[PDB]
Design a binder for this molecule. Structure first.
Ligand code: HEM
Ligand code: HEM
Ligand SMILES: C[C@H](O)[C@H](O)[C@H]1CNc2nc(N)[nH]c(=O)c2N1
Ligand SMILES: C[C@H](O)[C@H](O)[C@H]1CNc2nc(N)[nH]c(=O)c2N1
Ligand SMILES: N=C(NCCC[C@H](N)CNCCN)N[N+](=O)[O-]
Ligand SMILES: N=C(NCCC[C@H](N)CNCCN)N[N+](=O)[O-]
Ligand SMILES: C[As](C)(=O)[O-]
Ligand SMILES: C[As](C)(=O)[O-]
Ligand SMILES: [Zn+2]
Lengths: 402, 404
C-alpha cells in the first residue's frame, strides 16, 4: 500500500504516504505500466470544493475555526443554488501554488513557494486578456531577472465557451511549412503559425519570427494580437570559445510561459491560466535546438566543429550537444538573464523531495520527465526512485480549441 | 478506437496499439492510484496452467497448435506433474524458452539479437566442480577472442525439497571491492559484499582496483566451493583515449564479457536458479555507469581535472564534458582491441528496428523506458521519443534473493 522509495546512490529509503491522498486515477494498471506516455488517453463538485477549502484552512493553521466553517457553508450555499461557486483571492493564490507544487513533471518546484499570482478573473474581452497577458510578461521578465508568475483568467462555466489562449506558450517562433514539405523556423509551431495566418497575420520568413497571440473570449472567434517587440526579451546565442558559433545566428526567448494548460482548483477549472518561471538550459539547448523534429541543428554544429559525423561511435552527437547547451548557459549568463543548468536544477529538486518528505510524507514525480534529456545518470535524480500520482489542485492538459 | 494501449512516437508522429500485453499473466507494481515505474526492485494446480501455457507457446512457435504432438505433450506434462509434482522440458523446448525469456526482457535494449542465442544445456551437471567447467566453457565460447557471441548456460532446475544450484556472484566476471580502514573502497564499491564473502570462504584477497573476483559456486545442499578463473579466459581491455594521451595513463580497464549470473530463468513454471547468460556491452554501461556513477568507480572528477575543466561550478558542464570523453574512450579502446561493443546510438537504433519487427510479430514489445534510454545523450537517441508499454511476459528472467 505504501511505496518504498530508494535512492540507489546513497542507500536512503522513504515511504510515500502522500500518494494515499490521490483522488484521481492514472494510466497504469497492475497488468501494464503506461507511465512513459505523454498524454492521457453537484455532489461531485461539492466534494472537490469541501476538500480544497479544508486544504486552505489547514494551510493557514485554522481548521475547524469559525472562518473555516462559515466558508464551508458559503460554498455549500453557492453550489446548491447555482450549481457552482467561486474562489476568494487568497484561496486562488493558495490553489495556484499548490497546483505547481503537485506538478509531477516540474523540476523547479523548490520554488513553489514564491509565485506572484494575478487575479484576472474580471476579464471580459480578448483585448482585456491581451492587456493582462502583456503585464504578466513585463513583470515576469523583469529586465532579465525573471520572477515566477501566473495570471488566472475567468473559470469555465456551464454552457459557455472557455476563455483560451490558442498559443502553446506566450512566446513561440513561427513554423512555415515551405514548398518541399520541409519547415522554416520552429517545426512544433507549424500548425499554430498557420491558424494565425488564417486569421489575418502578415507572416515573416525568418527562423525566429515571434508569433502573434491568438486570444479567445467565450463563444467568439479568436482575435489576433501582436506582442510589443520590447516586451519579448531574446537572448542571442554564442559560445565561450567557439568564435564561429555566433555566426549561426541562433537565439531564444527568455520567458517560458505555458498557456495551454488548464488549472483545476477545488473542482473549478481555469482554461486560461498562463504561468512562467524560468528556463532550464537543457530545454533550449537539448530539446528545442537538437530534437530531430525541432530546429535539429545537431549536424550543423557538428560539421562546424569538424566532427566525424561519418559514424555514431565518434560520438559527434554527444559532443555537439554539450557545446550547444554550454552556449545557451553562457549566452543567458552574459545577457544577464535567469537560467538554470540541469545540475543545479536537479540538486535543488533533491532538496525539494526532502522538504516534501518531511512536510507531506512524499512528493509525486515523473521520473522520465525529471531526468534531463542529456547526462541523465550524471544527475542525482537519475538514481532516485519516484512515485507518480495525481494530487489536486493540479495543472492538466486540455483539448486544443479548434 | 482499439481498446488496447495506444503508443506514440513523438519524433515520426507514428502510432500503434499494443495488443501483446493482453498476454501478460503476472501483475506489475502499478495501480490506477500510483505509478511505480521508476522502481528498480518492486516487490501444482498453478504449475500446470503455467506449463500448459508454455507448451502452447512452444507448439504455436513451430506452427502445430492443436496437433497430435501438441495435445500429446500436454498430456505428458500433466501426467508427470501428477505423479512427481514437477516435470522436465525437452531440449528444443528449452532453447525456445531461453530465447523467449530474453525476447520478453523489458530492460534489455539488445533484444534485436534475441533470435541469435546459443543455448548450452547443462541440466545434467551435478557437482560444483562441474559447474566450473561449464562456466569456463561458456566464457571461452562467448568471448571467442573478442568476437563475442550471445550465450546462456542452463543448470538444473529447482527441485522440491532439494537445494538450488546457484552462483553467488552477480556476474561471472566482477572486480573486487575492498572496504578500507579510512572508510573508502578500493576497487568497485558495487562488489564489497561479494568480496567479504569470498574471503569468509577462503579466497586470498589482493589489493588493486581491478582484481578479478573468484567464483562462488553452490551445488544442491552444500556450502559454495571457491573457484578462481584462469587469467587466460578472462579477456580485458585497457582503456585509452584517441586524442587525450594522458587518459591511457589512468590505468583504467574493463572486461569484455558481461555475464549476468544471479538471475532466475523461469520457463513454463520451472525455475532455473542458475542459468548465466551473456551478450556484449553497450558503451554507456562501462563508460557512464560503472566508471562515472557516484557509487561506483566515480572517476568523473579525476578525468575532469585532467582536462583542465572548472570543477568549481556545475554550470561549466564539466561532468557532461568528461563523461563524453570517458565514453569515447571505452568505445575507442574496445574497437582498438577488436572486442565487440555497441554504442548507445547504434544500440538504440536497432531497438527501434526491434520494436517495429515485434509490432508485426506479436503486436507489441514490453519495454522499460527508464532502462532503455541511455544514461547519457538520452533525447539524442530515438528511444527517448518512443512511448513504451511495460509488462511481464513468461518465459522471463527474474531477480532472485541472494542465497545468503
Ligand atoms: C521557476 C523555475 C522553473 C523551472 C526551472 C521549471 C522547469 C520545468 C521543466 C524543465 C519542466 C519540463 C518542461 C518540458 O520538458 O517541456 C517543467 C514542467 C512543468 N512546470 Fe515548471 N519550472 C519552473 C516554474 C514553474 C512554474 C512557475 C509553474 C507553475 C506555476 C510550473 C509548472 C510546471 C508544469 C505544470 C509542468 C508540466 C508541464 C507539462 O506537462 O508539459 N513550473 N518545469
Ligand atoms: C546481445 C547483446 C546485448 C546487449 C548489447 C544488451 C544490452 C543490455 C543493456 C544495455 C542492459 C542494461 C544494463 C544495465 O543497465 O545494468 C541489458 C539488460 C538486460 N539484458 Fe541485455 N543485452 C544483450 C544480451 C543479453 C542476453 C544474451 C540476455 C539474455 C539471454 C539479455 C538479458 C537481459 C536482461 C534480463 C536484462 C535486464 C537485467 C536487469 O534487470 O538488470 N541481454 N541488456
Ligand atoms: C516518450 C517520452 O515519454 C517523452 O519523450 C518524454 C520523456 N521525458 C521528457 N522530459 C521532459 N522534461 N520533457 C518531455 O517533453 C519529455 N518527453
Ligand atoms: C532510480 C532509477 O530507477 C534507477 O537509477 C534506474 C534508471 N534507469 C536505469 N537504466 C538502466 N539501463 N540501468 C539502471 O541501472 C538504471 N537505473
Ligand atoms: N520551464 C518551463 N517549461 C514548460 C514549457 C515547455 C512545454 N510547453 C511543456 N508542455 C509540452 C511538452 N510535451 N516552464 N516554466 O514555467 O519555467
Ligand atoms: N549488457 C549486459 N549488462 C548486464 C548488467 C546488469 C546488472 N547485472 C544489474 N544492474 C545493477 C543493479 N540494478 N548484459 N549482457 O548480457 O550483455
Ligand atoms: C560557422 As560554421 C564553422
Ligand atoms: C592524467 As592527468 C592529465
Ligand atoms: Zn506505471
Amino acid at each position: 500500500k505504501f511505496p518504498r522509495v530508494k535512492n540507489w546512490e546513497l542507500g536512503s529509503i522513504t515511504y510515500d504516504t502522500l500518494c494515499a491522498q490521490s483522488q484521481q486515477d492514472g494510466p497504469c494498471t497492475p497488468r501494464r505500466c503506461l507511465g512513459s506516455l505523454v498524454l492521457p488517453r453537484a455532489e461531485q463538485l461539492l466534494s472537490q470544493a469541501r476538500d480544497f477549502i479544508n486544504q486552505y484552512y489547514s494551510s493557514i493553521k485554522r481548521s475547524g475555526s469559525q472562518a473555516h466553517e462559515e466558508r464551508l457553508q458559503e460554498v455549500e450555499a453557492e453550489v446548491a443554488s447555482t450549481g457552482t461557486y467561486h474562489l476568494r483571492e487568497s484561496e486562488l493564490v493558495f490553489g495556484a501554488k499548490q497546483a505547481w507544487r503537485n506538478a509531477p513533471r516540474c523540476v523547479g518546484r523548490i520554488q513553489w513557494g514564491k509565485l506572484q499570482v494575478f487575479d484576472a478573473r474580471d476579464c471580459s474581452s480578448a483585448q482585456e486578456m491581451f492587456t493582462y497577458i502583456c503585464n504578466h510578461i513585463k513583470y515576469a521578465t523583469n529586465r532579465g531577472n525573471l520572477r515566477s508568475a501566473i495570471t488566472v483568467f475567468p473559470q469555465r462555466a456551464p454552457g459557455r465557451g472557455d476563455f483560451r489562449i490558442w498559443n502553446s506558450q506566450l512566446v513561440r517562433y513561427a513554423g512555415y511549412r515551405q514548398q518541399d514539405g520541409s519547415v522554416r523556423g520552429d517545426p512544433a509551431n507549424v500548425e499554430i503559425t498557420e491558424l494565425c495566418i488564417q486569421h489575418g497575420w502578415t507572416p515573416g520568413n525568418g527562423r525566429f519570427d515571434v508569433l502573434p497571440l491568438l486570444l479567445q473570449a467565450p463563444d467568439e472567434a479568436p482575435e489576433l494580437f501582436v506582442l510589443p517587440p520590447e516586451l519579448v526579451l531574446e537572448v542571442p546565442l554564442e559560445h565561450p570559445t567557439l568564435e564561429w558559433f555566433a555566426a549561426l545566428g541562433l537565439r531564444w526567448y527568455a520567458l517560458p510561459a505555458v498557456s495551454n494548460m488548464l488549472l483545476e482548483i477545488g473542482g473549478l477549472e481555469f482554461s486560461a491560466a498562463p504561468f512562467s518561471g524560468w528556463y532550464m538550459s537543457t530545454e533550449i539547448g537539448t530539446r528545442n535546438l537538437c530534437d530531430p523534429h525541432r530546429y535539429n541543428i545537431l549536424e550543423d554544429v557538428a560539421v562546424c566543429m569538424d566532427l566525424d559525423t561519418r559514424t555514431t561511435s565518434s560520438l559527434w552527437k554527444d559532443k555537439a550537444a554539450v557545446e550547444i547547451n554550454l552556449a545557451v548557459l553562457h549566452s543567458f549568463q552574459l545577457a544577464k538573464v535567469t537560467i538554470v543548468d540541469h545540475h543545479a536544477a536537479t540538486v535543488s529538486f533533491m532538496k525539494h523531495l526532502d522538504n516534501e518528505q518531511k512536510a507531506r510524507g512524499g512528493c509525486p514525480a515523473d521520473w522520465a520527465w525529471i531526468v534531463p534529456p542529456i547526462s541523465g545518470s550524471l544527475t542525482p535524480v537519475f538514481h532516485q526512485e519516484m512515485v507518480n500520482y495525481i494530487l489536486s489542485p493540479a495543472f492538466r492538459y486540455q483539448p486544443d480549441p479548434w
